[PDB]
């Protein structure tokens, strides 16, 4: 039972690490896209609520 619980914990930790790596990769891709296109296009979103 302890081995099964450890396996479940390891699976959860692996899923968490995969999510963190995916978030880091998405952040890097978004940063590259912002550097290429330019953040100025987001300025129009300032009037959504303000």
């Amino acid at each position: 039972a302890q081995a099964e619980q450890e396996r479940i914990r390891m699976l959860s930790e692996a899923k968490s690490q995969i999510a963190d790596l995916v978030t880091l990769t998405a952040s890097r891709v978004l940063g590259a896209e912002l550097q290429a296109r330019g953040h100025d296009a987001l300025i129009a979103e300032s009037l959504a609520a303000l």
Partner: protein, 370 residues
Amino acid sequence: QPRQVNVGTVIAVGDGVARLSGLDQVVASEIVEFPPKAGRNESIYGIALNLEQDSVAAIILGDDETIEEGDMVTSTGRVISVPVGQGLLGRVVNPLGQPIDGKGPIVYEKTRPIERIAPGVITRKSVDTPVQTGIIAIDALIPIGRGQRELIIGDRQTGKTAVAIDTILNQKGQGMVCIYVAIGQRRAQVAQVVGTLERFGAMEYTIVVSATASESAALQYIAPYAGCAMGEEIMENGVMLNGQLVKDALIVYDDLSKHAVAYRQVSLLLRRPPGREAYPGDVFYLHSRLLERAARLNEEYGGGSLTALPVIETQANDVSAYIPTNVISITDGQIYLESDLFNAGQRPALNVGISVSRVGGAAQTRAMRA
């Protein structure tokens, strides 16, 4: 999905207490977020306790070394709340509902606010269904019934945690969901308790809410109220245990004296005026809020119940101290464990002469009562 949030600036952060400057229209017990910044990728929440003119003194639910002067705090509109439901059974969670056993995320759909008003004046009912502790001395002489809050008061090492764990283990098939709130208890001892619960298969119906000693005094202060909210949800909505809609909860506060110490720490760091033994004035109110939420509701309100088993250590068997007398006044009965009886071979160590159960025979089976 952009939204406008109220923002303040941390103008003074100290030993777990921060003055949040301008956070106007903040609710009196909100959760300030402290959004992540350079060097910290997570959010450290806090409880906005003192709403003073031009200041919001907030205790910090976490590590305050990362918070820096001038940091922006966003006031989440929600009052301090804890996730509740079926998903917490068998999980060790810190008082914020975040798992600390690393077995995955907590699957939940409802978050009940801690620090809720008592279940009601007329909504309760007479305590009749017994709680089978499994200890002959308790089950025969000092009965505990569903909906009765029974203090376990004793010296430093007499068997209080042992009695609580025996009670938790005995509720195998009696349709009871146990909760073990570990306030100020060392992490190794909480790990030992969890190992004992898992060894006897009592972790299929137990929720452990641990705010260990290293964790900030705010977490220890809210440690019992979370968990009490969990039991409130269990008695009000029920959980599917063994295919049955169990609506009975048995909550054990590991040490309310450590909770009172944590409240004293957060009050004195907030520079609130002290009282007796440096405790704040409203600490009897502190414990009466927590213990009066354990009730046996009538059939019109669900018929569920919440049984509380507070635990208190007394210095040199001084049951005349401030917190021990307060909680003795609050509770419906006392279980006195003495070192003199414990050493003399009486292992449960109950001082049956002075231990009392105000519910009495109504908390016993007719066979046991006879």
